[PDB]
Structure 1
C-alpha cells in the first residue's frame, strides 16, 4: 500500500494532515477535491502532490466551523463554486489602470471590473476574513481570489452575466455598514408625511434616480392614493452613497461624483464601463482607458462621497 502525505483545508490557513492511498482517487477519499482551483476529484495522487494543500468541502464538524468563520456561509456548494471560479480567475489579467486594479476583459466580466474599481474608491470594510484577505490582495494587484469569491458569494459562474447594482448589494451585505443611517421623508398632499429610517445596506443604496442632489431636493414617486408623493433625504450618515436607475442618457459632471457605471445596450446584451472623476474624467473599460473633460452616456449607477448631511427642508 503506497501513500503520500497531503494537507486538506477549507481556508488555506488551517491545515489538516492526510495520509492518502495512491491507488484511490482524491474523490474516493475526500469527496470533491481541488488543487488551487483545479478539480482533482477524479485523479489519483501523484508523487509531486506530497506536502501540497488541497481544498475540500466542509464535510466534517471542524471544517464546517472553519469555513463559517472564514467565509460567513454554510451554503454546501460554496467551496466548489469558489474553486471552480478561481480556476478561471487565476488566468485573468489584472492591469493597473490609473492607479487602480482593473480586470482585462474575459468571460463577460465587465460588471466585475467596474465593481472592483468602485470598491477601491469608497470606504468599505468587509466582514468575512475571506473577503478581507482577498480584497487586500486585490488592492495590491492580485485579485484572482477576490474575483472568485465575488462570483461565489453572488452565485454567478464565470461567463454568466451580472448586474453591478445587485453585485454591490451582495458585497455590502458582507460589509460593516452598521454606522450607516438614512432618514427619509415621504410627503403626499392628501396623505401627509411619513418618516422612515434605514440602516446598513439600505442606508447607502437608492434605486430610482442617479442624482444625489435631486434626492435631497425631492423625487416624485407613486402614492397609494394615486397622487405623486415626494420622497426626500432628511439625514444621511454614510461615507458614500450609491444612486442607481435604469440606464438612461445622463451627463456626469467632473467633481460632482466619485465614480459611476455605464451600461451600453439592451438588458442582458450590453457591456459595462467605469467612469471615475479625478483630475479629469477617466473612462476605464477593463484594460482600456480614455479621458474627456465632459461625459454623457447610459449611466446606471453613481457613487458619491458623504460624511454627514442634514436637510434644510422645513416640512
Structure 2
C-alpha cells in the first residue's frame, strides 16, 4: 500500500504545541500512546484529512512533556490527564447560561454540585496555584466553563454523572489555591478543663463544620468535652478573604445582606439536589439554569459563605 501522512500538533497544556507527522495507515494510539482530540479518545482511531493542523492531547512519555505537564497541572499522577479528557468530552456538551450575571450550568449528569461550586467560586477571592485551574477559571467567568468543570472532576477524582458534596469539592479546590496567609484563632472554654486557644493555617482556617451562622461561631457554639461537660468554642481571630460555614442540611432562613452565598440541599444523603442562593440587591436562587427571586429564603442549607478581611474578638 501507499504511505500517506498529515501534520498535527501534540501537547499536554494546549500552550506548548509540538508539530508531529502521523501515518494515516496507523492509529493515534500505536504511534503516540493514549491520544485525545477535544477530550474525545482517538487512541484506536486512524487519522483523517480534517485532523491535519488540529491540536491533540498526549500522555507524557518523554521528559519535556513530564515537566510541561507538572508545571501546568501541579500533579504527576499518570491517570489525571486521561480523566481530564474523559470528563471534558462530556462537559463540552453542557450549556453554560449567564444567570443573574454569573456563569452557571444547565442541569445534566448530576452537575448540580458543580454549578453551585462554580457560581460560588465567581463570588470569592481564590488564587489558583496550578495554571490549568487559573486559565480555565478566567475562561469560565466569560462563559466557556467546560474546561474548568472538567478540571474540577479530574482534581476531585469524580466522573461525569456522579453527584458530589459541594463542601468536599471546595475542600479539594482550596488544596490547590493560595490560602497560606489565612489564619484562624479559636478559644475553647470548659468550666472544669479551662481554656485552650487553637491557630489554624491554610484550608483549615476558612472551613468549619457544625454551624452555618458566622454570627453564632463568633458568639461561641456548644461542643462536647473530654470530662463530659459541654464546652464553648468561639472565633478569636479570622485572617482570610472569606470563611466557609458548613453543617448537615437543616431548615435555615437567609436574610438579604448577612451572607455572600449559600448551598441549599434538598433530599437524602448522596442523592439530593443542590441550589445556589446568592445575596445581591435582593436574594437570587440560581438552580441550574432556572432563577427565582425572594427578599428572604427558608430552605435546607448545608453551606454558607461570608466575605472577610481581619476579625478580632472583643470577648474578655
Q: Distance in 2 between matches of 1:280 and 1:46?
A: 54
Shift of 1:242: 0.5
Q: Distance in 2 between matches of 1:20 and 1:97?
A: 44
- Secondary structure at 1:156's aligned position in 2? coil
Q: Distance in 1 between matches of 2:280 and 2:52?
A: 50
Deviations along 1:38-62, one digit per CA (max 9) or x if unpaired, are: 1101101112211211001122211
Deviations along 1:94-124, one digit per CA (max 9) or x if unpaired, are: 0001100011100001000000001111111
Residue in structure 2 matching 1:167, options 159, 164, 169: 169
Q: Distance in 2 between matches of 1:232 and 1:46?
A: 64
Deviations along 1:212-268, one digit per CA (max 9) or x if unpaired, are: 010001111111222211111000111111000000011111110000000000011
- Secondary structure at 1:19's aligned position in 2? strand
Alignment of 1:136-215 (within 5 A): 136-215=138-217
Q: Distance in 2 between matches of 1:139 and 1:219?
A: 37
Q: Distance in 2 between matches of 1:253 and 1:223?
A: 33
- Secondary structure at 2:245's aligned position in 1? strand
Q: Distance in 2 between matches of 1:195 and 1:91?
A: 50
Q: Distance in 2 between matches of 1:85 and 1:304?
A: 31
Q: Distance in 1 between matches of 2:31 and 2:164?
A: 36
Shift of 1:305: 1.2
Q: Hey, which bits of structure 1, 4+ residues long, moved more than 2 A? A: none
Q: Distance in 1 between matches of 2:9 and 2:248?
A: 48
Deviations along 1:12-53, one digit per CA (max 9) or x if unpaired, are: 010122222211111111111000111101101112211211
Q: Distance in 2 between matches of 1:290 and 1:59?
A: 50
Shift of 1:2: 2.2
Deviations along 1:37-90, one digit per CA (max 9) or x if unpaired, are: 111011011122112110011222111111110011111111110001111111
Moved more, 47-56 or 295-304: 47-56
Q: Distance in 1 between matches of 2:101 and 2:89?
A: 26
Q: Distance in 1 between matches of 2:62 and 2:163?
A: 34
Alignment of 1:269-280 (within 5 A): 269-280=271-282
Residue in structure 1 matching 2:117, options 115, 118, 126: 115
Alignment of 1:28-43 (within 5 A): 28-43=30-45
Q: Distance in 2 between matches of 1:190 and 1:92?
A: 57
Q: Distance in 2 between matches of 1:63 and 1:209?
A: 45
Shift of 1:297: 0.6
- Secondary structure at 1:266's aligned position in 2? coil
Count of aligned residue pairs for this structure pair? 314
Shift of 1:174: 0.6
Moved more, 12-21 or 298-307: 12-21
Q: Distance in 2 between matches of 1:23 and 1:128?
A: 38
In structure 1, what is the equivalent of residue 77 of structure 2?
A: 75
Q: Distance in 2 between matches of 1:305 and 1:19?
A: 52
Q: Distance in 1 between matches of 2:141 and 2:169?
A: 18
Q: Distance in 2 between matches of 1:14 and 1:225?
A: 60
Shift of 1:205: 0.5
In structure 1, what is the equivalent of residue 22 of structure 2?
A: 20
Moved more, 64-73 or 225-234: 225-234
- Secondary structure at 1:274's aligned position in 2? strand
Moved more, 146-155 or 184-193: 184-193
Unaligned runs of 5+ in 2: none
